[PDB]
């Protein structure tokens, strides 16, 4: 059980770190940008999806403690 | 110069991560090889004991016995490490590179091997080993294959010694027996211990000495046979020196004289004696009471005791060979330990 | 590597990666999920590991078995 728990914690932690660096990269790309409207809308949708993923993954890391 | 006695305190301490099993001596340079229970083979240098020269892991299981010999062709060094992984390994030392160089691994044993020996008689190097397979096995170092496999005992042999064409073998069935090397015939059998034989070795010739009572031959038969007295160490807390009888000289066993004779018994150890090594007049032996004792051949009494040498069991001792003129008997002797330490005495 | 440690008795070196994994090269155990900060070793051998996950886990190394077993965590 501790091996399974450690594997899940490592997986979700490396996923959250990659997601945070992806948010940083997308924010930097959007700041550089600020077809133009199309990629701006794509960046906005990616920001919204990444924010939703970050919210649900902070929720699941909250419940791993429980 | 052959009556050197080591001092009370250890010269320096060698740190090993696990249990030390077998310790050998380099006959040319002050280099000690230290075994592990984990199977790692070390090579420490006596002047700088900080880091090993070559820490090579060779076996997944423990290693039990070693032998080392500097060959004399008509040259280099051979290290053999008998192990618990159903096989033995052979190593060659490179002085220029200071690293272990593997040669070959000899197979054939159907259980774990507990003894190994290497020697030369006439321009041919042979390797012997003995295992829990109840059979004494022999090998040719240059060829690589065996020559003769035979069982001398019902139970399993533990330790051996050899010179020329004669092999004796201590056994788990508390009996000693000479096994002839070419013929494979048991010349004589011995009884008198009450426990399995831990280590056993021959007592050989010396050239000049004031007076000897346990190495010199008596008659011309002893003089030309060259095999007179042997000492056996067994788990009954006793060390005994055993008279071997004459054969009916392939030599034949003597029907009325095929029995060994115990001459002198030594006692005083608080646990099982583990290894012995004769050096001139002094019989150096260990035990499992955290001590190493020094026994005299003549008076049969322990002159010096090294109490609390380790905090655990003392496993193996080894000296420099003294009955040959090729290697001088330098004043160096190193012990092992169950408590992950090794101590060497110098000067 | 975020920290480096060496065995004071035997020729062994302990390496801790930036991802939290600890490797013992003359074993691979993840003592902490987050990135470790620093380590200290004192001679039984006890290794104290501290990370940014608000949890400090202490692990001990078995020399005979060549494996690391955790004892307690703060």
From Swiss-Prot, chain A:
<protein>
    <recommendedName>
        <fullName>Dynein heavy chain, cytoplasmic</fullName>
    </recommendedName>
</protein>
<comment type="similarity">
    <text>Belongs to the dynein heavy chain family.</text>
</comment>
<comment type="subunit">
    <text>The dynein complex consists of at least two heavy chains and a number of intermediate and light chains. Interacts with DYN3.</text>
</comment>
<comment type="function">
    <text>Cytoplasmic dynein acts as a motor for the intracellular retrograde motility of vesicles and organelles along microtubules. Dynein has ATPase activity; the force-producing power stroke is thought to occur on release of ADP. Required to maintain uniform nuclear distribution in hyphae. May play an important role in the proper orientation of the mitotic spindle into the budding daughter cell yeast. Probably required for normal progression of the cell cycle.</text>
</comment>
UniProtKB/Swiss-Prot annotation, chain C:
<protein>
    <recommendedName>
        <fullName>Nuclear distribution protein PAC1</fullName>
    </recommendedName>
</protein>
<comment type="function">
    <text>Positively regulates the activity of the minus-end directed microtubule motor protein dynein. Plays a central role in positioning the mitotic spindle at the bud neck during cell division. Targets cytoplasmic dynein to microtubule plus ends, thereby promoting dynein-mediated microtubule sliding along the bud cortex and consequently the movement of the mitotic spindle to the bud neck. Following plus end binding, dynein may be offloaded to the cortex by NUM1. Required for viability in the absence of the kinesin-related microtubule-dependent motor protein CIN8.</text>
</comment>
<comment type="subunit">
    <text>Self-associates. Interacts with NDL1. May form a complex with dynein.</text>
</comment>
<comment type="similarity">
    <text>Belongs to the WD repeat LIS1/nudF family.</text>
</comment>
<feature type="repeat" description="WD 1">
    <location>
        <begin position="1"/>
        <end position="27"/>
    </location>
</feature>
<feature type="repeat" description="WD 2">
    <location>
        <begin position="31"/>
        <end position="69"/>
    </location>
</feature>
């Amino acid at each position: 059980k501790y091996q399974d728990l450690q594997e899940n914690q490592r997986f979700v932690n490396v996923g959250l770190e990659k997601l945070n660096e992806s948010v940083l990269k997308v924010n930097e790309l959007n700041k550089t940008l600020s077809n133009v409207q199309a990629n701006l809308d794509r960046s906005i949708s990616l920001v919204k999806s990444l924010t939703f993923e970050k919210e649900r993954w902070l929720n699941t890391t909250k419940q791993f403690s429980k | 110069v052959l009556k050197w006695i080591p001092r009370n305190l250890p010269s320096c301490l060698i740190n090993v991560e696990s249990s030390v099993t077998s310790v050998k001596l380099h006959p040319n340079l002050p280099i000690v090889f230290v075994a592990t229970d984990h199977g790692k083979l070390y090579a420490f240098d006596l002047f700088n004991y900080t880091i090993p020269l070559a820490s090579l892991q060779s076996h997944t299981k423990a290693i039990t016995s070693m032998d080392v010999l500097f060959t004399n062709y008509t040259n280099y060094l051979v290290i053999v490490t008998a192990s618990k992984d159903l096989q033995i390994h052979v190593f060659k030392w490179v002085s220029e590179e200071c690293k272990f160089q593997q040669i070959r691994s000899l197979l054939g044993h159907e259980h774990i091997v507990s003894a190994v020996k290497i020697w030369q008689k006439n321009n041919d190097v042979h390797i012997a080993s003995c295992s829990r397979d109840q059979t004494v096995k022999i090998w040719d170092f240059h060829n690589g294959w065996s020559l003769k496999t035979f069982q001398p005992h019902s139970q399993w042999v533990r330790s051996i010694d050899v010179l020329g064409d004669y092999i004796i073998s201590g056994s788990h069935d508390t009996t000693l027996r000479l096994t002839h090397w070419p013929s494979g015939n048991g010349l004589s059998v011995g009884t008198g211990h009450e426990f399995p034989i831990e280590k056993v070795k021959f007592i050989h010739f010396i050239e000049d000495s004031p007076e000897i009572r346990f190495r010199t031959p008596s008659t011309d038969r002893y003089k030309n046979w060259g095999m007179q007295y042997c000492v056996s160490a067994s788990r009954d807390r006793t060390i005994k020196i055993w008279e071997i009888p004459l054969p009916t000289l392939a030599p034949i066993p003597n029907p009325t004289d095929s029995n060994f004779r115990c001459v002198l018994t030594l006692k005083g150890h608080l646990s099982w004696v583990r290894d012995i090594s004769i050096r001139g007049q002094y019989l150096f032996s260990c035990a499992d009471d955290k001590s190493v004792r020094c026994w005299d051949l003549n008076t049969g009494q322990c002159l010096h005791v090294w109490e609390k040498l380790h905090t655990g069991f003392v496993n193996c001792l080894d000296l420099d060979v003294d009955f040959d003129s090729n290697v001088t008997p330098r004043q160096m002797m190193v012990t092992g330990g169950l408590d992950c330490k090794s101590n060497v005495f110098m000067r």
